[PDB]
RNA sequence: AGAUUUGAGUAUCGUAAGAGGACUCCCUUAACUUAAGCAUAUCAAUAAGGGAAGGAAGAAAAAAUAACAAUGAUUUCUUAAGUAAUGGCGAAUGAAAAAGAAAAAGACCAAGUUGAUAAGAGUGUAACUAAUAGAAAAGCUAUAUUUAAAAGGGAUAAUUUAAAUUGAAUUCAGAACGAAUAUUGAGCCAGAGAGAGUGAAAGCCUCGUCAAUUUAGAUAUAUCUUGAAAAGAAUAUGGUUUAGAAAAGAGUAAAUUUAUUUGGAAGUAUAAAUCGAAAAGGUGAUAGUAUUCAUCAAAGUCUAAAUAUUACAGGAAAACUGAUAGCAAAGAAGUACUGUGAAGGAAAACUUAAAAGAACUUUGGAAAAAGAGUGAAAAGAGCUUGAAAGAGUAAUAUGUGAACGGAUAAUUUAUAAGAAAAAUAGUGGAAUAUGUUAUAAAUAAAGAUGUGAAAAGAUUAGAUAUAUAAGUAGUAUAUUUAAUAAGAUUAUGUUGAAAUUUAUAA
RNA sequence: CGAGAAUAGAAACUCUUGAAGAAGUAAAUUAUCUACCCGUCUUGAAACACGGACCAAGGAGUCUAACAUGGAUGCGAAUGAGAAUAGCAGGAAAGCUAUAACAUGAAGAGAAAACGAAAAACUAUGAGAGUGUAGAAAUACAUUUAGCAAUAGUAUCUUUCAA
RNA sequence: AUAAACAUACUUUGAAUCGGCCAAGUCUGGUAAGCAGGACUGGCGAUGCGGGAUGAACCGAACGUCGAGAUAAAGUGCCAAA
RNA sequence: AAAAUGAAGACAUUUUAACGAGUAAGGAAACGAAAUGGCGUAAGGACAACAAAAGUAGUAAAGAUUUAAAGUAAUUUAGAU
RNA sequence: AAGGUUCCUAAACAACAUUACUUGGAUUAGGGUGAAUCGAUCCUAAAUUACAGAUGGAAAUCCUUAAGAAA
RNA sequence: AAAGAAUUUAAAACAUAUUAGAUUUAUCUGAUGUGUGAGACCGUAAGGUGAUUUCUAGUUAAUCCUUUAAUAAUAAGGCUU
RNA sequence: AAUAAAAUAUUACUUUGGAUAGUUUAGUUUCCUGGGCGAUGAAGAACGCAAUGAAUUGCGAUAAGUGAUAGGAACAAUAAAAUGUGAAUAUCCAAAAUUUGAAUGCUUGAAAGUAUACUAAGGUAUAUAUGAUAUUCAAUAUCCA
């Protein structure tokens, strides 16, 4: 075998030896101690986007990202000046890449802030916001009286529908044709009457608890949900559905371009 | 085992240690035992030596009893009017004696000895109110699983377990072909002579029965 | 183990083993591959004859993530399931529920039509497939997916 | 004369220089070497020469990748990868996006706007200023939403750094030695049996070591006080009457040529000569034009953390060397010594436990010698031991132009093998052999197949408490309420191999 | 006269020397036979070929990186994941644990675009297993059966202008 | 016909080597050469032992350490066994 | 090389048969019937008086000089000083 | 000029001066160099080197009164 | 001519219309609006309709591969000789 | 034929030499923490200082050491003196710190020196470039009575 050995300048110069490695780690990890013990949100390390991979080669795959867009945080609820404050990464350099993303990350916000627990600027019980609170939770006595008759005269056509099916593949699993195309049709007709303003920032989860410290947000709030064997009906046009053809017709139907513009000219 | 990163076990650093110290350090290594006399009166273990003190050797050739005369750090050892050799020509010259070959059976306290040995001693007093606390803690750990039994068993004398259950173990066939020739030769070589000393125990009682 | 070269061997012996006419001296031809073309040209027409030369067009920078593609063969399809799966939809047919093999989910983007599946209904869903793949999946009673 | 511009002298308060440069940022067109010659290429951002820095430095917030179900400052590690590419396509040279981690942080000038404009600038200080990316000022306002009187002081606690203190258990007994730590016997401590010293080998003689204490120094670490908990202020989307009807980095980007560099190949980067933009534009690495698409918005600045280190200082370790070894240097070692100079550059460890380093007599000019004495022992300072080469003394043996070696015997010397004992015929059987029993021990099971329990959890459906919430069973936490699916782990039945082999006592 | 065979018969000893030194061995000398200077280049050196005055200590196939064959080892369509890195007890350059990016392999041909493997194979000789007879000690024949590895040759299929 | 089961067929990995020299009921150039160059085989190199007094190649014959015999080349007046 | 025996003896088993010259060069370790067998230098991890004081050592270690013994050899062992 | 205590004296002869030495430029210990007038110091010769200026990527080079609000 | 549901609620680019202001220059700056660009087929009645793909018959066009966002005509690079 | 003077060989003892063995206050490598110089004069060089010192060590005309704070009875080769009314010893402290050296008033070869100002002798300041402020000036450079 012909050998390729780049040896012929000085590589005893060119060594590199990891004599400190087993002090990187005892560094590394005394630093992440002492971070955690001087501000424990800070070594939190922030939360941060599930973002696809890049390429076809990864694309079905998700990765943590950096900071939510600023559209994601609208979505959410959230400002953007107090994003930073409570554990947040942001960055304005992201563009939205598509509905789906917008609305995946949404979610993760959302679920952040019913995990978050911020407590008071001021320790003192005279705060100002330990007292506003107290001053308007008599008016959120009243207005969650009414978050609660709505969410539940609105959506109990479906509950029913949805309770149904439930039970219905249960009794399968011990029909659902009938049964899912029930909750199908409600679902549309459930779409189109949506088509209506909201809050444009909900509020800061702020109260007085025992510290439960934790040392990430990003290991609490998963990515992906675990990946079960999905099963599905055959019917007669999977069967019929001829995949080869689609592929060589899409292929076809890129490479003739070239012909149609050349006929045009002529 | 040492656990302080700080100190070196080190012999070499250890003695250049020795050598280069300084007076400071070398007073405090010249130390000498207080005698049963001394050492009821003060409660006191050693102390280091000093001038005019009377001491009593008690490992060499010569065990004298005299008064320290010269307590010399450079050479860390000291010297006694009693212990001297005549210099051929007729002079008499001391000799150099260890500071811990001889303890003290009259001290020379002016002011200061009569400090330390007041520290020395509350530290003694102190250390054994900590001790007490220690053993009396670990007492009342073994009194609450145990409480039938108390804490003086482990100061008497340990009866073995003479039970002798066996197990069977699908290797014990094996054993014989698990060993190298080295420690197989060894091991039956064991059992030969073994039986051999069990034959001649035999025979011996065997003839005192008869 | 330097006890166990041959250097310890041959301590005694003059020359080493290396021989008293033709001794070992610095070079024996060049350094690297010198003199491919030269005196060392019986060694490469020998063991690499296509060494020397050019052979097809240059990219001047490789994509090789567009290249990525990796392939599987029909019968070793239902191993990404399992057997206790492959045996429990042993007896469906058109109707009822049939389990699909996600080939992307595992890693695998083409699939290849390569021996014989098992005479049972499946669903297929992956990017590619290639004409005796999708033969032999129809031929047993299954379907054929897209993906991406 | 006076108002400015520009340039000097002097005075005051400061600033730069030099040392070091291991790691950091750069300037410069080395050659030996490889290519079996050699001239491009390689050696090679390599040697030397030169400049500038800090405890780290450099870089850093897209005129960036990609063509995706797309990402998103910088830095460093893994992989891509000896791959794309470059090359007398020879020898050889050779990246990066993606992906996985360590760490994470973003802010400013210029330009624009506000102009009863603000001891120094009006040729302009100051205030506002960006991804819904036509901003910018004054006053009203609606909705959500953030919000204790900041900063600086004082005190306690916690986390750390250093110093000091403390820190167990034979001052045991016998024998013997110049000497006990060794040896014999009897004990004890141990969160301490790492190590050093001690006439000689020590867990218990000293110093330390394990567990600790105290005192000082910091943290942007929490609490309480100063400190009132108010007035207000702040974020974003609107409405309203005025004010205004913008800006976004120029000898720069790019182009022709030359030179170096690059994996970058009809030009990746830098520089020089010439030329030189904009009602913008750059990139999508095969030159050109056109039409779409995608993605950024250069030509000013700063920015912690993850990272490097063989200067130097302080420590800790070692399957490293043990005085021709390991640094050149285990002693007044970059010393002695050489050279006009740049520079070159060694050798040399050990008496004894303790100098107790002979001390007085005789001979000799003296050095010394012989006695004498010290010491366990001269080990006597040219001092632990003391080899070979070379000598001297004693004992033994041999002999004509070499000597040595080998086989075989002779002579001389040395080494060196032993205390039992015969035949026949009265007693006397003694270990052992045979087989008879008794005992002891060892030696047969790999599996297969039934029936339960079960921790931490998962899912689903309710309840209570808290927070936040008006759109397809709200969400999240804590405690329970029932139910289904599995469950690591775990308990116990059935099934299925003996009859031999040694030792012991008659 | 006489082979085979059946039947009966018979072998246990002497001398000398040796702790006043046997047998053997060693050293020195003598005597017969025998013996050119080692290392090296070389067709050929004891060579009038070179190095060697003598002695002591030092003294020369090693280390890092890529590939291949091969012998022992683990796992096996997977192997490795002591990739970085992240945790655990113990205080630890040691040890243990991380459903994981990737490396090599499971698919091959083409410069590339574009593609991507069965007639559930065939033939030949071949490893092994039985039954019977006999020699007669082992073993030697007759016959029934299976045909793995290996080699060679066939159809069939993927890719290539071309296998 | 004769021989052949520690037969036969090999596969993989690799060392050293390709300065040669001699003999002859052989040849070529040359007056000739212990010269130069070749065909076939055997040797020396890599090889000691017995004989030719001595010798790289000649003749006999190839070697673990020994004892006893029959031999080979060649010898039997003395050196020297006959 | 072939037969026989084979958990441990021991001398790397027992028997029979054939063989043994050699420069350059090769035969790494392990492999019970062992796919060559061994000696020596130094350091690291274990083992070394099996009954609770467990290799040797001031009743003389290492080293040096010699005398003898074992081994074909590399070398080892013991005595005396 | 170069050397550097070799100068003088005393004690002493282990080493060194190719024998020896009671001698010595050798060992040990002391003592010794006095300037208004002699020289250096002052001036300039061949030549040499600064601030500013000029040149250079750099180290540095050039200029010595020309270029300077300098001398 | 033969088979053919197609997967399921959080949205921005602006091609524009139509207005509120400013401007004259190669004119711009907000907001309102529909489509674009949208995809849950009608079934408890057997299932039809229907995108999208297949075969056959004429038509016009392109046709060795590449310049890696897509094409074109030039240019350049590949493959065989 | 004879000699053993020389020569040779073995062992014991002694000698020249320093191998071997035992040993280490020295090195080498890796890792952790820092990476703390200078016009307030650094690093380097020179000279001087001990009761008896040549080197070395420490120090600077206050000299192998001064004050202060800790510290508790020594040093020693030989004398002295001091010493629990405080000896040794330790120090990121205080005072002090000669001639030079970036070297910086001018000069410097191995050079001895020397000018001015302020407070005879002593001690300070005065190099080059440079920022801000103050003051004095220069040029019709632009206006301008």
Not at chain 2, 161 to 168: D, G, N
């Amino acid at each position: 075998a012909v050998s390729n050995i780049h040896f012929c300048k000085d590589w005893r110069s060119k060594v590199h030896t990891w004599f400190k490695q087993p002090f990187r780690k005892i560094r590394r990890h005394q630093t992440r101690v002492e971070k955690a013990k001087a501000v424990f949100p800070a070594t939190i390390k922030s939360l941060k986007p599930s973002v696809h991979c890049m390429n076809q080669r990864f694309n079905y795959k998700l990765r943590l990202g950096r900071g939510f867009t600023l559209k994601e945080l609208r979505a959410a609820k959230i400002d953007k000046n107090l994003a930073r404050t409570i554990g947040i990464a942001v960055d304005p350099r992201r563009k939205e890449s598509s509905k789906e993303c917008l609305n995946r990350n949404a979610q993760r916000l959302t679920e952040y802030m019913n995990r978050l627990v911020v407590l008071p600027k001021v320790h003192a019980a005279t705060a100002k916001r330990l007292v506003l609170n107290k001053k308007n939770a008599e008016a959120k006595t009243k207005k969650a009286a009414e978050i609660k008759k709505f969410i539940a005269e609105h959506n109990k056509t479906i509950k029913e529908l949805k309770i149904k099916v439930a039970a219905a593949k249960k009794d399968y699993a011990k029909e659902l044709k009938a049964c899912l195309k029930g909750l199908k049709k409600a679902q549309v007709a459930f779409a189109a009457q949506v088509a209506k303003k909201t809050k444009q920032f909900n509020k800061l989860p702020v109260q007085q608890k025992e510290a439960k410290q934790v040392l990430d947000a990003n290991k609490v709030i998963r990515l992906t949900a675990p990946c079960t064997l999905e099963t599905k009906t055959l019917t007669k046009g999977m069967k019929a559905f001829d995949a080869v053809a689609h592929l060589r017709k899409a292929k076809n139907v890129a490479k003739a371009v070239s012909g149609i513009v050349k006929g045009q000219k002529k | 085992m040492k656990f302080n990163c700080k100190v070196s076990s080190n012999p070499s650093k250890a003695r250049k240690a020795l050598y280069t110290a300084n007076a400071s350090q070398r007073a405090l290594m010249m130390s000498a035992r207080l005698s049963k006399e001394l050492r009821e009166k003060y409660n006191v273990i050693a102390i280091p030596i000093h001038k005019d003190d009377e001491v009593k050797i008690i490992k060499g050739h010569q065990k004298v009893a005299g008064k320290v005369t010269a307590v010399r750090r450079s050479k860390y050892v000291i010297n006694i009017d009693k212990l001297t050799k005549t210099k051929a020509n007729g002079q008499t010259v001391p000799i150099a004696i260890r500071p811990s070959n001889v303890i003290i059976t009259k001290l020379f306290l002016n002011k200061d000895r009569e400090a330390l040995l007041a520290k020395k001693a509350e530290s003694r007093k102190s250390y054994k109110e900590l001790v007490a606390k220690r053993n009396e803690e670990v007492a009342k750990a073994f009194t609450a699983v145990y409480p039938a039994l108390n804490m003086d068993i482990f100061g008497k004398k340990v009866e073995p377990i003479t039970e002798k259950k066996p197990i069977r173990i699908p290797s014990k066939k094996m054993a014989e072909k698990l060993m190298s020739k080295p420690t197989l030769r060894a091991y039956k070589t064991g059992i030969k002579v073994h039986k051999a000393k069990n034959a001649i125990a035999a025979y011996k009682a065997a003839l005192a029965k008869k | 183990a330097t006890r166990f070269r041959q250097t310890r061997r041959r301590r005694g012996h003059v020359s080493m083993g290396y021989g008293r006419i033709g001794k070992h001296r610095k070079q024996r031809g060049g350094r690297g591959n010198a003199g491919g073309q030269h005196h060392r040209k019986t060694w490469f027409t020998t063991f690499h004859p296509d060494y020397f030369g050019k052979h097809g067009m240059r990219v001047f920078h490789l994509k090789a993530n567009k290249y990525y593609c990796p392939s599987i063969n029909v019968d070793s399809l239902w191993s990404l399931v399992g057997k206790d799966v492959q045996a429990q939809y042993k007896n469906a047919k058109v109707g009822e529920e049939v389990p699909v093999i996600d080939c992307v989910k595992h890693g695998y983007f083409k699939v290849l039509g390569k021996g014989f599946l098992p005479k049972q209904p499946v669903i297929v869903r992956a990017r590619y497939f290639s004409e005796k793949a999708q033969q032999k999946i129809k031929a047993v009673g299954g379907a054929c997916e897209l993906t991406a």
